[PDB]
Symmetry: D2
Subunit: 124 residues, 4 copies
C-alpha cells in the first residue's frame, strides 16, 4: 500500500536521533529508535499502529508508536509515545507530538510526564 511503503524506512528527527520503522499490511508498526551517535547500547524497540487505509483527500496518514526506555543494558524507567501523521510527497515528513512518562511515586506524579514535538525526515 501507499501508506505502508511511505512509512517504511529510516527517519531522522530534528535532534538527529534515528527512527527505523516497518509498516505492516495489518496496521502494525515495528522498529528501532537509536541515538544520533549510532551507539549499540542506544537502541530500543518500538511498536505502534498506523491507518492502513488513509483518506484520499490529501490528508496525512495517522500513526503512533511507543518506546519503553529499557534495552539489554539500560533502563530509564520511562516510555515515550509519539502521535502524529505521515505526509508523503517529495520531502515526505512524519510530524509528531510526544508524551514521555517516567515511573514516579504518587507524590511526584505531577512531574511524571514531559511533552514535546519531533519532526522526521526520511533518510532512506
Amino acid at each position: 500500500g501507499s501508506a505502508e511503503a511511505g512509512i517504511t524506512g529510516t527517519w531522522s528527527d530534528q535532534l538527529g536521533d534515528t527512527f527505523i520503522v516497518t509498516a505492516g499490511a495489518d496496521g502494525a508498526l515495528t522498529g528501532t529508535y537509536e541515538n544520533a551517535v549510532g551507539n549499540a547500547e542506544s537502541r530500543y524497540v518500538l511498536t505502534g499502529r498506523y491507518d492502513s487505509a488513509p483518506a484520499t483527500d490529501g490528508s496525512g496518514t495517522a500513526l503512533g508508536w511507543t518506546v519503553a526506555w529499557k534495552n539489554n543494558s539500560k533502563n530509564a524507567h520511562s516510555a515515550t509515545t509519539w502521535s502524529g501523521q505521515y505526509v508523503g510527497g517529495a520531502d515526505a515528513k512524519i510530524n509528531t507530538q510526544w508524551l514521555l512518562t517516567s515511573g514516579t511515586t504518587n507524590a511526584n506524579a505531577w512531574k511524571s510526564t514531559l511533552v514535546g514535538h519531533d519532526t522526521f525526515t526520511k533518510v532512506k
Copy 2:
C-alpha cells in the same frame, strides 16, 4: 514478574470504555480497546511497550500504547497514544495522558491533535 502480571487484565476508563491488555516478558503490550457498550464493530487493536523491570522504590511502572482507529468496518483516520504509569496495590490504577492525531491537510494541521487524560481501574 510483578510488572507483567499487574498490567495484564481488563481495565475500564472513567468514560466506561474497556482496555483489555496482556503484558509480555520482553516489554510488549498487546490487546484490544472497546466501547462502554461492548459492540464488535467498536473493537480495535492496540500495541505498545512497558518497563518490564521497574524501579523498586515505590514508583509506578512506565508504559504506553497506541490504537489506530481502523478496524474491519470503521475508519476514523486517527490514532491515539496513551502514555502513563501503572500503580499497583489493592486499588491498582493505570494513570495516563493521551494524544489523538487525525490525518489532516497541512493547512489544518494545527487542529490535528487532541490531548486528554484517562484513568483506568482494573475490573478483572
Copy 3:
C-alpha cells in the same frame, strides 16, 4: 454575568493547592495561586482570560491563565499555563490541562515542558 460570577471565587485543586480568582467584565482573569499548606512565601500572581459570553447550549466556558513561579522570596525559573473550561451547576468545576515550561539550555529543551491536568472545586 453568569460566567463572571461562577468563575470568581476560591478554588482547590485535587493536590489541595488554592486558586483565588476574580473574573472581570472585559474577559480578564486575575488572582493568586497559593500552596496546600497556606504559606505567604508560596503565593504567586495569576493572569489570564475567559470567554465572557459563553454559549448557552450546555457547553462550558473556555478560559486559561498563567503563573510564573517567581515571587519576592522564590524563583523556580518556570511558568505554568492552565487551559480549560468552567462547568456550572450544583457542583461547579473548572477542568483543566496544563503545561509547565522551565527555562533550559537548548540541549535540555526536550526536558523543558511538563504536562498534566487539574480539576478544581469551589471552596465555600
Copy 4:
C-alpha cells in the same frame, strides 16, 4: 532588564500570525494576537506572565500567555494558552507549546482540547 527588552516587541509564528507583546518589570505580559492577513476584526487581547529574573547560565526565560477568542466582532468560545521560553541572542526565538480548549458539553469534553507548538521569530 534583559528579559523585559528581549520579550517586548512584535513576533511572527510559523503560521505567519502576529503576536505583539510588552513585558513589564513586574513579570506581566500584555499585548495582542492578530491574524496573518492583519484584519482588525481578527485582533484579540493577550495576557500572561514571565520570569523577570531568569538564570544567567545559558537557560531561556520561562513565560506563558493566554488569548480568549472573543473580541467585539467574533466569539469562537475557546481560549489558547502558550507555555514556553524566550531564547535570546542573534537569532532570538520564543519556543512554545500550546493548549486550545473549546467550551463543550461534558459528553464532548474529550474533544475539547487541542495541543500544538508555535515558534516565534521577532519582526522588530
